[PDB]
């Protein structure tokens, strides 16, 4: 859109003298008073430059894997939420490995994990049900917990209004199948399960409610969604053998 | 407030005619407008929606248990701070613990600590005093190292407007009397600090001061505010023997 | 249109902490806002819905049967209006009878007709015309009465702006050929004439004219506009026999 | 008004090259913007569209015949209403008739009443009293009922700020002097009276009051207002004989 | 509110001079220019004032009486309306007269009936269920006639946001308790079945559906709602003998 | 766009009463509104009519024709410009007149050329390069002169946005094919060279630069651009013979 | 208008205290105001002031001496123009001459033509015709050459909104009565012709049309219209002899 | 000004998370803002954008020569004018000639003048006299002939605000010292004088008085201006002989 995108008009001379299109001097007009009116806030932002906002990632840096791992469907009663997934330690890095690796490999470059998510899209199953959904969630656990199927609504996270709620699980406890920049190698689950210090602690116990004041059928998608950095060279792929 | 809360305006039939409130109609022509409004505006969302922004933790996700420790007075110099707590690491320890478990006992639910917050309540004790408040802080020492009593204001933290000032203590250093999630055991405090790998090492040294230049005699309440995320089951609390 | 249709944002975790889009808070902010600006002008709205509007019946209740009768083309002079209909009551409820019952039978379902209306599509002949079009019209007249072919403009019913004009024949006089919700039977047009009382009275004479200073030639499509309430069973058409 | 009504600026070449008047050209941008402004509201006007208003008819369709029948002068008690008159049915249609047949006659026209209106022209005795006028009516009563001077104020009609308050008596129950489109005819009142079905039922028991807190003399000019639709051909009236 | 009530300010005489409240000038200010701005638009006003709005009866004119019938509950499919009542006109007239009379009576006040009509007020059963209710209705059948339990949707009637509707039934047709103003006689049910022309014809057929996509269970309160204008004397109720 | 281009909303009569759309009212308001506004400002306009513009010729009066001679790429270095043609006269009248003819021939209808125009299409030779163009010319020179390949940039005519320049050589001094209106004749380049008084004078010498602080390679396409006036008959092309 | 034409308000003194009208400080505001809102928008103007706008020489310099020539009426066809005059040269300077001397003399002052215009005022010939008018003229042509007398709209000038256009003939090829400032001379139309050194070839050749789609009657004055520089000295008309 | 000249805000990485400064974001809002307040003005702009202005020549293309030639002071009555200069065609060219060439030699470059100017910069000789000042002038005048030294205003020129007035002396009967682009040649004013077709002829007699109703003395600084279009090689002066 903006279809003249700020190169409106022409020019041309008449004897000698020069001629500009009238709406390209009403921009110089505007853009000089939008400049203007930026210096009168110009201190508002020097101000407001005291402080930052955060990229979102998804709309942002790093590649974007989103390997879903099952669909599940709760009946959430009101000022209840429902548990989304119970596994032990060693079910949660079976299928963490399992599925990243087969959906991901071939891994032709190098590349680093910046941040691992716990995705939740969550879609109510009923039209006409005007609410909003809530979360709550546990990272680690004693391995021999398994997590209360329902509790009660008491200071969830509020999810966002398009339904999408991303829980990230942090380097700080947490194996990854590539902890930082490395080549990809032979790598199989076993070799990997014996690496992890704290298999069977760290496992997320997450929950879904609603703000709804009836029973509610939710469909909920649940993903591990990879935030890479790649570094693929800027080198072609030659059919072997090269040149 | 706003009473007729978007559902003003009736209906009615007048000879198969049909008849709306002039104010309901009034309202489909702002919203309408505002929607519009919100279009022409899209875009710009579209470029904000870019960025994100945290949410407050204390009007948020978590429970609000702030375990008070003591109260304290100073005089602080102008451009100076004065130190809040000089405690040990086995000190500080003894504290954290002692004052969370008394205070959170009976924990009858399971839980996990999202995290530990250092929080400074902070009041002028003179009236018409017009300043704001400031803070530093160290969070972990060198265990045979006490700070100094008084320090020069240097690029301190500036205390937001409400004089209350939170900070955190990362679980990548300190340990939780609950680090996850975990039902809770027979505990005691030299259980505790046995399992404290680095018990007299993290201990937060903090120190506030305030942007006056005349001398402030300042009161400060300190807590200990966990954000607790508490997994309590949807079940009712029987007397005994259920059933 | 507004595509993130007031849904936009999403929402993250990063170490425990809740992350929101910005432009979503955006939003929050503005709806907010619109409804704090709602709150000042709500008297205003309890004083306008003190008072109340007529829904576009060809826009709202009822279902649109559109009978068109017949073409005419007419030279309008000046401050002139000309007659568009001049028939007897005998001939005007054989062409209702007729062109309605024709053209919408089968009559698959009980129904009502809400209101019969004498409709006028008015285009002008020449381009570059800037008027518009005025009306004036009798229900009923003595039976022996004919209209003028041409008066003068005196206190006309201004069209509106699309130059459309529908002009009810109430149920206050006008035979109807299903007088209110029934059945639909075994009608020939002799048992319709022999059941209205008042055949020959009841007859629209309708006139037409312009705003404009010259001779006009102008275009009058005619149509009978039924606005029917239909009672159609929520069930299936079958096949005979039925099972 | 608005005096270069749209048609401002002129035109002139010089050596083969254009030029325009400069307000013109501003025109041009406002007119071009309003219609910018139109399109970004046309979707609310879409909306607005889908409701209705109603032509004043004193301002609009059909001539303007006031009939003038009586002044009348009240002492209004506080939350009272005077009865401003008590007629049989008989001799409201001795006046209605005799008074709209003297004062219109001669008919020169075919004409049609399009409704039949009870005018109240209110006007304040006293200067510096600020207060609205009210309204109660019957149309039709038992004949031998006749209304009490004096009722307290209950939900009365609160007439516009102009202080002209309009009642029609519909045609469904009260006889016209000529109760559609006719040739005017020789017209006693005696045959009129015993061509209404109802004579003595259908009278208009009209009473006024105001929003004052004081005794209010007031003063009430009464009319009948014809609204009628004249079919007056678009011919001469020539002296005799015609040719 | 507003509390000084535009009487806002005082004045004093200083050594012969006056001096007024700056407040009180700032109000001189504001209203001369309310009014300045009202001149401007005082020709939009002209052109608005050609076209008039209804006065919300239930807001206005008239004595509120709303005889509530009976309450039902409906399960309704999507895009389909069910049915209210389905009473024989023999069975409407004797609900209308009976609950009417039995809990307007002792009438002790001269009155007329403005409108008699039909109301609906819908709820909900189910919380967070974002819809509008849709209406359609026969005033009219044939007797023998008996409605459908549920029909599809086909250009209904689009209920207002407060869930109330109300649908009046013309003088022209429904035979009424008290027809115009009259004493309250000796009445009962037979004497007035006997004097309706049309009992078994003219009673009331209605539909309710919604706008959700779901079934929803939907609460239906029907009243009917009598607009009385009472002609109640301003005189006391003395305890007789009177004097 | 703007779809009821002003003609919006529809009218109908109920029971003679005459009904309009609410939307097309709302225009009523705005259109009178905005009249009013041009009221206010109808002053303002006097005083701006005071002065005109000069309309683009090549959105405007004459015909468009641009006879392309060829294309030329310049290394520009900064603060210079680079000469874009250095023809002789009788070199660049070889190059006007076979260009111009070859392209427009066969002229078939009467013609008069209002202004011959040196047109600069100008394109950067990089992306990323932020920067205006500049121009400089003389349009007659000693004939035995040439000019420098490269100048230095000294209060140039600043190109237009869209970065075409057009230069017009005036009837005083250059002549044309066809200098006024004239049916087209039998012509060839030596008897227009023989007519043209001063053959070898008037040759456009048209400089380039830029407004960058880097050498610019830049693509200079190069037309002239004649506006010609057509005086073309309302007359059918035949096939011969004609009838 | 603007009465108090910027000096409102009055001053005085009481008690050696100065007083000062409240409104006339309102001035004070607003006017430093104003030119505070000119100091912001200053740096605009200096980028507006790098640009120049034409005077409309009829409302500034120079005398308006319009000496019409005739009037004329066409028939134009849609997308066509009608030529106004097909003079020989002999036969426009015979005109030219004789219409401004005749109705010039006497030339009692000193005074140089600074422009020459051919003026048409254009006017529709019939009411509620909406369109405009449109130009294309020939200023010289060969002196055998007459134009057609219809032609087809290509790229015609648009003429103002006031339906007047000017057409300046230029001083480069156009002879004048009085080519420069001269005293007035002995002057018969012989002499004129035998000075003009083109007497044959300069003659303007005007067409109109309109933007109309329909056959539309036009009137077309025309006029020439003289813009003089007049030198009258500042010295009385004397009755001879002087002194 | 503008200091962060719309490079405000810088960006950071904590632990992977990208986050950039707000004040930054708010433009990122604003500018995305401002252009989609240019797409609903971008029509406007095309209208607009069918008109063009001119460009300020002495801000503007070409070099700014101001070759002064005298002051003077004269006494103005009201409305009238007084001549600033009377020169014989002669003693114009004298002074052109030789004011041009001692102030410009050495002309060291190639050089075309694109326009002649004659310059009035005009003053008030008291203060505290608010008016403007008016202008007249002939180009050219018999040579025998002198002008009024005093005339009446009629029509004139209204000067700018800043009190300068710039009149051109076209390239059509003027000769310039140089005519186009040409080397400077061995040249001397008797040369000059017999190249001049019409020395005698071509000579500015020019006017000024005022819009004040009282005489004042004003002063009238006169320059020639000269603008140029220079055409200096991009080569460096070398002191002899080179390399």
């Given at each position: 859109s903006l279809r003249y995108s700020r190169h409106d008009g022409t020019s041309c001379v008449i004897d000698n003298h020069h001629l500009k299109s009238l709406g390209a001097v009403l921009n110089d007009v505007r853009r000089k008073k939008d400049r203007i009116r930026e210096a009168e806030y110009e201190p508002i932002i020097d101000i407001a430059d005291q402080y930052m906002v955060t990229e979102d990632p998804?709309?942002?840096?790093?590649?974007?894997?989103?390997?879903?791992?099952?669909?599940?469907?709760?009946?959430?009663?009101?000022?209840?939420?429902?548990?989304?997934?119970?596994?032990?330690?060693?079910?949660?890095?079976?299928?963490?490995?399992?599925?990243?690796?087969?959906?991901?490999?071939?891994?032709?470059?190098?590349?680093?994990?910046?941040?691992?998510?716990?995705?939740?899209?969550?879609?109510?199953?009923?039209?006409?049900?005007?609410?909003?959904?809530?979360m709550q969630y546990a990272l680690g656990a004693h391995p021999d917990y398994v997590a209360h199927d329902v509790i009660r609504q008491q200071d969830p996270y509020y999810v966002g209004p398009n339904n999408i709620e991303r829980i990230n699980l942090s380097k700080k406890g947490f194996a990854f199948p590539l902890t930082c920049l490395q080549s990809v190698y032979n790598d199989n689950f076993e070799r990997f399960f014996d690496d992890v210090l704290w298999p069977y602690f760290y496992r997320p116990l997450v929950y879904v409610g609603t703000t709804s004041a009836e029973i509610e059928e939710i469909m909920i998608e649940v993903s591990l969604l990879f935030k890479i950095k790649e570094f693929a060279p800027d080198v072609p792929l030659f059919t072997g053998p090269a040149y």
């Open positions: 998804f709309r942002g840096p790093g590649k974007n894997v989103r390997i879903t791992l099952f669909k599940e469907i709760r009946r959430v009663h009101p000022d209840t939420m429902k548990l989304v997934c119970n596994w032990s330690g060693k079910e949660f890095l079976r299928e963490t490995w399992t599925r990243f690796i087969s959906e991901e490999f071939p891994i032709t470059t190098d590349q680093e994990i910046m941040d691992l998510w716990f995705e939740l899209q969550l879609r109510p199953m009923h039209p006409n049900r005007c609410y909003k959904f809530t």
